[PDB]
Design a protein around this ligand. Structure first.
Ligand code: CUA
Ligand code: CUA
Ligand code: CA
Ligand code: CA
Ligand code: CL
Ligand code: CL
Ligand code: K
Ligand code: K
Lengths: 581, 581
């Protein structure tokens, strides 16, 4: 199978990698494993001015004050259990956010901070009938209200919540209070059920305490029952949030009608739905197993028709040491990372189910050594009913000697594995920065990208609205609007000249520069940097970008195009002249 | 030759890429072209906390307020015209800086704002007898003083300057005023001479006016004469800067002792010393030529033995449309980018010289089409007398259709070219983010990196010193020091436990957390992230890092390790508890 993409040739799949602790999203070509684009999300990017521009800061809201993020889980919007290629969503663990990327422009266009929670970790998407909800985990137990009066985790009102976000609006839709905590999550192929893993059912703060129970659980959610309760107006609110809050804890040994708790050993981690829709598969982590829950049996569990919640367990196969995550080939095989054994294990799901019933059978097909200590793994289209069993990426945490020494900080090793055959063949070691935990692959024909910006694009629609209030037509105009010590420069840009090449202001004036790239040629980006003022942004073809800064320094100050756009690029410059105070 | 590095195999060269206007430095393996490591410099890195930690902000001094940078020209220190692998230096055009990276730890350790200039662009290093000076071009003409009294570029005191920095101390060494401006620069193989290109001899501000005269110049500096005058006290200063400033402007048609101006067509760009040390070669940009200055002849120019400045020009080969940069194979051939023709032209230098002298020889050997619009190119070891003629990287600005569509903003195309034989051949297309401009390659055996940190490392020595004062032994202690409204947490970390797992502070306190990674095994890095507090940092084996922030939010606040360090990493957490107002 394939492997080398020589000059002129194109990759077959897009990869969307999390940037990890660095905070961005990265687009790669598969199987070349080359990075094609960096998508700034929670990081501040000097190149594009994400985190610096008015458009980007507006999307971020108040969280624009944070220079950091921590992502793990990129996921693509679906329709009928199939990628529709409209949206990618990703978590921020550091500052408790969920972000949307529009796959047509390859930019983050929505960002929300989840209210009344701490640490958005696990995140996956509703599959069916489509991605109406972004389900997202809040990992850490906190007091409610968190005012510094109560610190106890055991306190009745100390808990965390499972979060649902409207995918289209990017507003909270509801929250569910749970016992224990939440790690990872996934969703069924009907839209009625979602599940999440929990490693801290003990509600402990110390290391030994979190490991005390032999089993924790995966909590199952009846999303339909939840929605009906929100609709009937049976919910509460907390503090300053309008978000409907539902109670999915167990009261006095009896289930809330929103949730079921299926005990699972031990500090489980991964929570993955098989591509046939049959199973939620929890990776056992401290237990050398996966637990297979049958979605088939879930209606009966919620209709109180099953004696023990363990009855929905249909398979609990032994796999090896340190199972973290599971993916699928769409041929009936599951593939699990074993962190401690440092392997990917390939196993037949339906044979494990047989084994659980006592049938004598070898469900393990193969173990492949990886280098080293795999966390997540991802097989192409695994999260869809179209899982194609072609490629597998295993993202390993310790690269040791697999790449040249680069000092005491090492890269992660994301290894491309051929899975189209009976035998898994390691094909490529891919060094990556700042620990992408997980990734997702899409067919090339599943992604449709704008070649150039449309002038009515929502991304800078507010900046367009500001321009009309000024009677400024962005497509044509090159003017300076003055309003107190506010200065609003509006300009066209065209390789190799700025539409406005000089302007004068007073020391202390607040300057906003709005640039519209009127070039029609694809790939002709411009940039705008103001020297010694910490101002930098990108303006791609047919885009409008704006940036606000203070001219605290008197004198002549140069602004230049940062993007090489033309033979006379070095000369694409202008002058801001600041009068003394 | 080569091309493919498979699993378990290692690259043959280190590549060091400028991150462009993204702001960082990137480490690659050649010939795989894979990104092994990112070294944050002018960017804020959320992963390692560069820009957030006290160690980094201290290195950045006052400029730590800037979140942006624009880097172009990475260069490795040399000893007797050969790489010595101690430091890499890089410019920042956007905020007028020069950074130093220690190649043993792959971190930026020193950073200077260059006084009284605007935009540090061109940069190269003294070659022989070693890298004593870092030379850097300030590109834009500004008034002196720059206080908003004069804006006219034609004024007696409106000018830019050439800069010399002591490579070891990272202090200013001297500055030389020049006419016109400064684009790129290189140095000879003796230490006496340096050269720079100028494209704005007209001192205009508009596009047409910068293209006014058919020639500008390269300006040659006599570093020995400059050093002679500085120690003979003969220098001026500008404002509050101690930096010795010398005048290299032409007076009334008469030269200064420090410079000579050699007319060159037209808006010349790249300035490159050949590997035999015979030529400063300037790429012609608007002239379809390059210009060859015989370094041989510079002593007679400066001594007044030569009739006219053009006498040091021993070659002006016609090469094609829009020459930008030149590199060398160490076989007598030069390789020049043609931005307009989109080609690398390979040519024989000695033959070009003989063709300027009259002889009719075809000095052009080959033209290779590149994709598309190349800027810089770099041949392996080209800046040393060991130029090995094996690899060539042409860094092109328009990727067009060469990679998968990823939206309106396109990657750059950095193309690996095999030049070890007689014919240049294109072997690999490497997509890169944010316009890397230039890059430098080094033999594997030229770089030596630390596997773990030394406890006594200068990088965090100030933090060690501060620890003494509080009475703290960093290798062992887990303490909290109260000092008014300032709390100073010291802790060791050892997978998978923080040394301090909870602390309590009062609303409003200034909390400094200092972490020392006492793990002994390589690659066992830890992280530190305070949830919803914009706090994030790396701590690698044997390192001490510190971050300061304001606990302004009452309640329970989780901190967690961001770097996957152990099987129980998810559980490597801690609590900050904040006592109400
Ligand atoms: Cu616009 Cu370079
Ligand atoms: Cu320490 Cu993860
Ligand atoms: Ca547990
Ligand atoms: Ca000129
Ligand atoms: Cl998962
Ligand atoms: Cl150059
Ligand atoms: K690591
Ligand atoms: K480009």
């Amino acid at each position: 199978q394939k492997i080398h993409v020589g000059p002129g040739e194109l990759d077959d799949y897009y990869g969307f990698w999390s940037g990890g602790h660095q905070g961005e999203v990265r687009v790669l070509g598969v199987p070349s494993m080359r990075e094609l684009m960096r998508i700034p999300v929670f990081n501040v990017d000097s190149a594009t001015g994400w985190g610096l521009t008015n458009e980007s800061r507006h999307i971020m809201g108040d969280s624009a004050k944070f220079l950091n993020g921590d992502c793990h889980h990129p996921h693509i919007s679906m329709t009928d259990g199939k990628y529709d290629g409209k949206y990618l969503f990703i978590n921020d663990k550091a500052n408790s956010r969920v972000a949307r990327i529009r796959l047509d422009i390859m930019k983050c266009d929505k960002m929300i901070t989840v209210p009344n929670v701490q640490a958005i970790h696990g995140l996956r998407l509703q599959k069916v009938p489509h991605t109406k909800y972004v389900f997202a985990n809040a990992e850490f137990i906190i007091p409610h209200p968190n005012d510094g009066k109560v610190f106890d985790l055991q306190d009745e009102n100390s808990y965390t919540m499972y979060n649902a976000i409207d995918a289209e609006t990017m507003e909270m839709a509801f929250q569910v209070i749970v016992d224990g905590n939440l790690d990872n999550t996934d969703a069924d192929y009907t839209g009625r059920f979602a599940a999440a893993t929990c490693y801290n059912s003990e509600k402990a703060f110390d290391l030994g305490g979190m490991m005390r129970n032999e089993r924790d659980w995966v909590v199952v959610f009846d999303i339909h029952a939840v929605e009906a309760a929100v609709k009937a107006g049976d919910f509460i609110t907390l503090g300053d949030s309008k978000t409907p809050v539902l109670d999915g804890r167990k009261k006095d040994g009896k289930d809330s009608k929103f949730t079921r708790y299926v005990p699972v050993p031990k500090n489980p981690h991964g929570c993955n739905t098989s591509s046939d829709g049959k199973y939620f598969i929890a990776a056992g982590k401290l237990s050398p197993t996966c637990s297979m829950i049958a979605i088939d049996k879930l209606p009966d569990l919620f209709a109180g028709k099953l004696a023990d919640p363990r009855d929905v367990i249909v398979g609990e196969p032994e796999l090896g040491l340190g199972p973290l995550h599971t993916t699928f080939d769409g041929r009936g095989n599951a593939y699990t990372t074993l962190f401690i054994d440092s392997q990917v294990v390939k196993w037949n799901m339906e044979e494990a189910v047989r084994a659980y019933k006592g049938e004598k059978v070898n469900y393990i097909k193969q173990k492949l050594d990886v280098h080293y200590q795999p966390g997540h793994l991802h097989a192409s289209l695994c999260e869809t009913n179209e899982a194609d069993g072609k490629w597998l990426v295993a993202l390993s945490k310790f690269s040791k000697d697999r790449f040249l020494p680069v000092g005491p900080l090492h890269p992660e090793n994301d290894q491309l594995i051929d899975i189209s055959g009976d035998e898994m063949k390691l094909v490529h070691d891919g060094p990556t920065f700042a620990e992408p935990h997980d990734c997702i692959m899409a067919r090339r024909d599943q992604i449709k990208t704008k070649k150039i910006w449309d002038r009515n694009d929502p991304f800078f629609a507010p900046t367009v609205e500001m321009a009309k209030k000024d009677g400024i037509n962005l497509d044509t105009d090159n003017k300076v609007i003055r309003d107190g010590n506010k200065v609003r420069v509006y300009m066209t840009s065209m390789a190799p000249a700025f539409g406005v090449q000089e302007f004068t202001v007073k020391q202390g004036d607040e300057v906003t520069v709005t640039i519209t790239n009127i070039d029609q040629i694809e790939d002709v980006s411009h940039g705008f940097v103001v020297v010694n003022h910490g101002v930098s942004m990108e303006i791609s073809p047919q885009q409008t970008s704006s940036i606000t800064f203070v001219a605290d320094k008197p004198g002549l100050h140069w602004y230049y195009c940062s993007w090489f756009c033309h033979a006379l690029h070095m000369e694409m410059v202008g002058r801001m002249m600041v009068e003394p105070a």
